[PDB]
Design a protein around this ligand. Structure first.
Ligand SMILES: CN(C)c1cccc2c(S(=O)(=O)N[C@@H](Cc3ccc(OS(=O)(=O)c4cccc5c(N(C)C)cccc45)cc3)C(=O)O)cccc12
Ligand SMILES: CN(C)c1cccc2c(S(=O)(=O)N[C@@H](Cc3ccc(OS(=O)(=O)c4cccc5c(N(C)C)cccc45)cc3)C(=O)O)cccc12
Ligand SMILES: O=c1ccn([C@H]2C[C@H](O)[C@@H](COP(=O)(O)O)O2)c(=O)[nH]1
Ligand SMILES: O=c1ccn([C@H]2C[C@H](O)[C@@H](COP(=O)(O)O)O2)c(=O)[nH]1
Lengths: 263, 263
């Protein structure tokens, strides 16, 4: 996509070189923002084929609020395999914070439901927020949340959402991160009978790993194509009752997938 | 400032109208970002006279971690007056979260010290973050945190910082908000022996109140002047030992102050 390729070019032209944790080395910039009008089409990178199978299951898994990978293994989604323990546990990562942020008074806070109610009852609120950055539980998580916090906004019947991503692997992670949240906006919008607004992506340490440079150049030499369109097959009784099969993207005609090694 | 006026112009040109609670209307956009290279000068708007007296005291107050306004009263700082209770308490706002975020256990996390240590001993970390958005204690705070989250970054020996502000009164609040965080970056940088980098401001619901239109047109008609320079008279022994008198600003030659009613 236009903004995605501009970001890659910028990291290339203005990034600072580092040698890092493990010594991979990256080119990085700090602070960036992109905007996706969801009505223009689903923001799935066309300059390299990307599949959402794993992303969808993962998102449904986040919404259930469970952090054990049992569900993911049932559907052959290995995204979190590398960090789960022998019991398949991950600690209080995303889903747990999203659905049951522990309130020391004994109970927990369901941020997804709070936000649902705010969007329906008080859509002008300037604090319709979901945070996964639970400082007091970071030490118990298998990984520190990268997509740390998101906020919703409503104007003229359109639902917008801004995500703050503290760290971003532009080549490997970013295409999936955009699709995940674009998907969530659509689901939220549907559950509130609102149209879809903008997905605003904001990043902190935004980088390209050195061993992704050939792949990056290859991708930069390709032309973005029309964006696919997202189709939701039914309106579940709630944001918590969607199923993998409810989603389908049409009109997706990407350039060939590009394989690359993870960091 | 150039960046500041562009945002004000943008909200005026592209912002959506909203007449809601009580009637106080606003023109707002969602999602914005701007960057201030602190080496270019201290980012205090020049198109209207702004004072840092209250901001400096408030920052020092945040850093002490005390949320009782006694210190603010002793210094004739009225910022929180309207919100403190009979005993002058505000609940677990900013200061409390920064210095002692309550852990589920029977513990407290000092985010400021954590960040100091990361910057000194692991500057390339991609999770050098301070968050005031403690979901579990939100209902106990006098006001929901506006400048909710900030992240640091280091490149070529320069300290950068990005703030996520969920809600922003562009005319009245933003000038002080930029100055506060710019100041913290200078203090943090001094304490960690680094030069100053960029202060990146990222906003969520960014608005201009309807009753600030005359002031806005007036300020938009003024040309920005050279940025002033912050002077820190001595290097304290720690980020928690700064004093009001340590700070000075030179070369500040602003346009006349513009008075305006607060919502
Ligand atoms: C976005 N996330 C969280 C995902 C993570 C892992 C696999 C994913 C797959 S997949 O199972 O199909 N695998 C990919 C290759 C891949 C590898 C890592 C990666 O994740 S990342 O870019 O965010 C990424 C890059 C570098 C380091 C990562 C790290 N650290 C701590 C080692 C932890 C978590 C993610 C990391 C993204 C994609 C493939 O098409 O073959 C599909 C969709 C998303 C995936
Ligand atoms: C949070 N910060 C930015 C501040 C808040 C209050 C007073 C401040 C002063 S001062 O003591 O010198 N007073 C100003 C007038 C004023 C009033 C509110 C305001 O705050 S704001 O633009 O962020 C602002 C605008 C609109 C609503 C606010 C709201 N609510 C819940 C009604 C709660 C908190 C802030 C609000 C900013 C300026 C003056 O010179 O007279 C100096 C510096 C910072 C102050
Ligand atoms: O959904 C994700 C999860 C992780 N990251 C990448 C960013 C970093 O390159 C790496 C995480 O490493 P740290 O920032 O935690 O060091 O994974 C993403 O881009 N997207
Ligand atoms: O330091 C601050 C504190 C508040 N606000 C403004 C944003 C809103 O106009 C108002 C807070 O209102 P809510 O977003 O909470 O409704 O004060 C700022 O701009 N800066």
């Amino acid at each position: 996509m236009k903004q995605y390729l501009e970001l890659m070019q910028k990291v290339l032209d203005e990034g600072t070189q580092k040698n890092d944790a493990t010594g991979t080395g990256t080119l990085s910039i700090f602070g960036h923002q992109m905007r996706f009008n969801l009505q223009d089409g689903f923001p799935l990178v066309t300059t390299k084929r990307c599949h959402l199978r794993s992303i969808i299951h993962e998102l449904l898994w986040f919404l259930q609020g469970d952090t054990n990978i049992a569900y993911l293994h049932e559907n052959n989604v290995t995204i979190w395999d590398e960090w789960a323990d022998e019991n398949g546990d991950l600690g209080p990562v995303y889903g747990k914070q999203w659905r049951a942020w522990p309130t020391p008074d004994g109970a927990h806070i369901d941020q997804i439901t709070t936000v649902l109610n705010q969007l329906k009852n008080d859509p002008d609120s300037r604090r319709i927020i979901v945070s996964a950055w639970n400082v007091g539980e970071l030490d118990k998580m298998a990984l520190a949340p990268c997509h740390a916090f998101f906020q919703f906004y409503v104007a003229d019947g359109k639902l917008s959402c801004q995500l703050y991503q503290r760290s971003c692997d532009v080549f490997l992670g970013l295409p999936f991160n955009i699709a995940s949240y674009a998907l969530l906006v659509h689901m939220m919008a549907q559950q509130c009978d609102l149209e879809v607004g903008d997905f605003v992506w904001t990043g902190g340490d935004t980088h390209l790993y050195s061993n992704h440079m050939d792949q990056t150049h290859l991708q930069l030499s390709r032309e973005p194509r029309p964006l696919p369109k997202l189709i939701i097959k039914r309106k579940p009784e709630s944001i918590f009752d969607y199923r993998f099969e409810d989603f389908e993207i049409e009109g997706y005609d990407p350039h060939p997938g590009i394989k690359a090694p993870v960091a």
